[model samples]
Target chain A: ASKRALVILAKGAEEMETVIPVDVMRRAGIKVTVAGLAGKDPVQCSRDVVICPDASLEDAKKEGPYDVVVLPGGNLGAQNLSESAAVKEILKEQENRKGLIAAICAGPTALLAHEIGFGSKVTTHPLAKDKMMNGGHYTYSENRVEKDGLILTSRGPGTSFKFALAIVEALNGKEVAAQVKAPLVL
Target chain B: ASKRALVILAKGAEEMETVIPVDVMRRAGIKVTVAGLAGKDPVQCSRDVVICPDASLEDAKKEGPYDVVVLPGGNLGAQNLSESAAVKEILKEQENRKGLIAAICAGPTALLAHEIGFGSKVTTHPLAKDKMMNGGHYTYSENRVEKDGLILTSRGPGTSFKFALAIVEALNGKEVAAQVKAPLVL
Candidate 1:
């Protein structure tokens, strides 16, 4: 069966963080849906890159039980993800199902907002450390990419490929991950 | 005056290569215009990530002579760039004016197609080597990012940050590049 991924795109999302995983996952032959957290509209990203999503989260959720759910980070983007009640429900359901849930940079802070993966060792961008580490619900690491069971996290834009590759390896296995890695010139 | 960049966005461009430079350059406070090569429309990238360009290349040209011209790579995207009389004219003008011209992955092949920089050392994605080496007009280097005078080239998505930082350094100097790199956690 083809693996499917849901990438939740929010306004002010890190354009690099959002696009790298979406691009790399597709390279890994995974079916990826770039879903807007707001609606099916062009999202203004942190650095002003506008991305048009495949669908809105409201519509995308109906097609779910995705193999993986991803969140990309920018401060405001993460804040939007952290505030959405729909995002909360999605994370809670995904956790209950034990599906792979990945977040990078400020994205992990959304996991905190939703109270998912409390005991996992995760990482976030250094600037986001305070917010993600609040209340000490999850153990934090300085690793580029952190995977605690199905909860995957990564640091910043520079680590996006490693973060996405980790998710690819988790879902697709080592050989497929290696194959995808080569063409990327990593 | 702040440096300005013109990033040509085309159908089937590599989204990672396209977004990274635009985002990073913006972070460095460069006035960047993500100009659509086709028109002021949403471009479908190589991995199917749709990007809304800031302006049409035709319209943006009226606002140029930008400090730099950037080309992102995918086989189809580079071919689009290579075939465009508009792209040819843009490169020729930029070269004659002695401005920085940067390309990544298969993007450097467009330089060959436009005959922008004949003697500079350059690099492209390994898979694009033969295409880029078609006539041996430019010397090939295996370095991840190769900058020979005003022409800067990089391999693929993995080296995008380095390639972008090279451009930032070229335009804003090493100190600004370092400041930008630190925040990205590169």
Candidate 2:
């Protein structure tokens, strides 16, 4: 069976964090959707790369029950995700169903805002650590990538490939992940 | 003075290879232009991530001689770049001016196709080595990133950070590159 992934895209999202997973997950044969938080428009990212989403968040949510729900981070993009009622509902439901929830860098902050994984050990960009731990709900790890059962988190752009491959290994298998990683020259 | 870059965006380009450099370069404060080879419409990349170009190659070329011209790689994207007369002209002119020409993965194949850096040592995605060495025009290296005089090349998506940082160091300086690299958590 083909695994499916949902990657939320918002204005000011880190384009590398967003693109790396989308591309790598696709390479792993997962049906990945790049969903626009603000509708299916071209989203101007934090570093100014404009990306057009595959579908709007509202439209993608109806398709539902993804194998993984991915959140990419930039301060403003995570802020946008944290502010959306739709995003809150999606994360809460994904957590309820025990589906995988993967986020990177400041992305984990949105999880905190939505209160989805309160006790899961997580990691974020060092710059975002204070914000993510403001209330001390979750224990923090300095590991490059952190996975505590359903919650998977990673640091910044440099770790994106590892983050995506970890998601692949979770959904597919170590063999599949290894197959995908070999060609990448990592 | 801010260094400027012209990145040629073609259909089927590897979105990771394309975005990483652009984002990293922008972090270094370079004025980077993502120019569309087929026109200004949003380009659907190899993994289906769509990117909106800042300008068409024709328009962007008119404003050059940029500090560097970047070629990103996906097999098909490099093929498209390899076949474009506009790309040929842009690369050849950039070489003649002693400006930097950077390519990654199969991107170096386009450099071979255009015959832009014949005697320089280069590197490409391992899968692309045969194609790049079809006529033994340039010496091949196994380095993750290789720079020979004006031509800079790197292996694959995994090496993009190194590739971009090499360009940063070439144009800006070691200090600027280090400052830019620090924040990326690389």
Candidate 3:
């Protein structure tokens, strides 16, 4: 069976960060579900682009056991994810299962909020570093992409490809990642 | 007054290509109108990411004489753009007025179809080179981003940020482009 990825889409999510990973992962043959945080309605992203999700998070949660759960970032979007009890439950479940959990930019702060991976080294958009490091829960790095065990995090929009390809490599392996990377003209 | 851009969004567009440039341009303070070619409805991109355009192309046309017109590429999206009479008219008007008309990936093929900027140097996704070179009307370069006077072109998805920043530099100058580039972590 194809590996599955669940991308949680919240209002004010960065559209570029959200779309890049979903498109690239699909290119790597991952079955990705773009689940809307606020039901199945269109989401208003940070830059005013509205994206319609494939399924609502409430419904998508019923389709248990995704290979990875991806969190994309905008300040407000991260705040939404950070405040969601449902998101907290989902991350806790994924962590408990030892499944991969990936996030980017301000997205990593949500992980900090939920307290999913303390002591794990991570990286976030420079502006978000303070927020992610607020409680000294995790060590920080300036690497564009950082993966300490299953908790993978990346910086901002510029690193989205690296972040996504890292997730692809993790789930599908290096060969698939290279194949997917080639056509992108990177 | 801020510079304005018109990005024609068609069905089967590469959502990554479309969203990246639109988001980046807005970040550079460009007032961008994502105009749906098929009218004011959601567009299903090449990889199945659906994007809701800001306005119908027909309606947006009335507000034009934009600073630059941007074309994002996907196989079918470019085909849709190549086949559109409205697009041809828009490109022609932009060219006649000596305004910038930029394209990326398979997007430059639409320029070939419209017979706009025929003698300029350009580039496209490697897979698109043959289609763009069918008649050899334009000189081609492998440069990630190519600008020859008012017509600008770029390669595939990975080069989208460079493509957008080049557009920014053209409209808003190097200073504004530099300021925008820093926070992007590029």
Candidate 4:
């Protein structure tokens, strides 16, 4: 089978954060399942752009376990995602199994809500420092991606590739990730 | 027909800068044409990722004008694009026409290279201020996007939508642009 990750979507997701990673990751050969929140047709990002999920949370649950669970942050989107019992359950399961967990900007805030950042050195969009630092050590860098064990976080939208590449690196290895990085000339 | 924006493939192109805007544009119903330099199959980003152009400059020139000519920047990517005759020619042709011209991050540096910013107030990624000042006033904002006349500029990938929406707002109006922004609740 193919490697897979679940992208959690809510009504107010940031468009670039949600799509850039999905496009790049798919280009990197990771099968992405856009899992939707309740009662919405297409998830919207930062007031523009709508991306319909590949599967609903119910449908995603039927797809079985995912190797990773991803979130792209907008305050409302993250809040909505965290409210989903299925998503919360998936996150906890991923934590137990040590699967990759990644986020960017406000996306990391969702992870903080779950208390996943405790004892971990992490990073997020600079503005979200206080929140990211709530239960973790927040070190800000313009890093495309930062990896602290199984948890991966990027600074902001510009760091999408870094965050995505980190996921590729963690799930696959440096070589595969490097292969994806090669064409973009990073 | 989907709208297309052609970006110059320079060394150190901020991968997210290009990808984020491109992805967002697509979400807004605009397609992207990542035009690579001559003989470069897939353009290299600042440190990682390879972005393959939908068509080469040679092909794009023959394909006629695009809806927008976008230049994104990094250190070498900015310089590399500025030094390219082909990219300059494209900009020169689109000058004062309906075709929108935009630069972001290091992209503003390329505009200076062409003397477009000789008297224009512009902005760029903070790190490139010294170089971007190139005989023009440069402002710094964490804003996602900005527009001065036909020229559009943005700070980083975080402003990808701001960049794209500026385009939409220019070509269409705030009404159409809102459709794109409504979902994200931004």
| Local accuracy by lDDT, each model | 0.95, 0.96, 0.95, 0.69
Spell out the clash pairs found in candidate 1: none
lDDT of 2 at B3: 86
Tens-place lDDT digits, model 1, residues A125-153: 99999998899898989999999999999
What RMSD, rounded to one decimal, does every model reach? 0.7, 0.6, 0.6, 10.9
CAPRI-wise, candidate 4 is: incorrect
Q: Write the per-residue lDDT of candidate 4 for residues B1-186, one digit (tens) a residue.
A: 666667666657776677566655655776566667664365656634454566677777767677888887677888888888887788888775657888887788888787663555566776777887744454544455667667778775556557767876676567877886654333
Mind giving the per-residue lDDT tens digits that candidate 3 earns over B69-141? 9999999999999999999999999999999999999999999999999999999999999999998999989
lDDT (Cα, tens digit) per residue for candidate 1, span B129-162: 9999988899999999999999999999999999
Docking quality (DockQ) for each candidate: 0.94, 0.94, 0.87, 0.07
lDDT of 3 by residue, A99-131 (tens): 999999999999999999999999999999999
The candidates score, on chain A by TM-score, as follows: 0.99, 0.99, 0.99, 0.88
Error of 3 at A118 (Å): 1.0
Indicate the worst ten consecutive residues by lDDT in candidate 2 chain B.
Answer: B177-186
2 or 4, which is superior by DockQ?
2
For B85-169, candidate 2 gives per-residue lDDT tens digits of 9999999999899999999999999998898989889999999999999989999999999999999999999999999999999
Candidate number achieving the greatest lDDT relative to the actual structure: 2
What is candidate 3's TM-score against the reference?
0.99
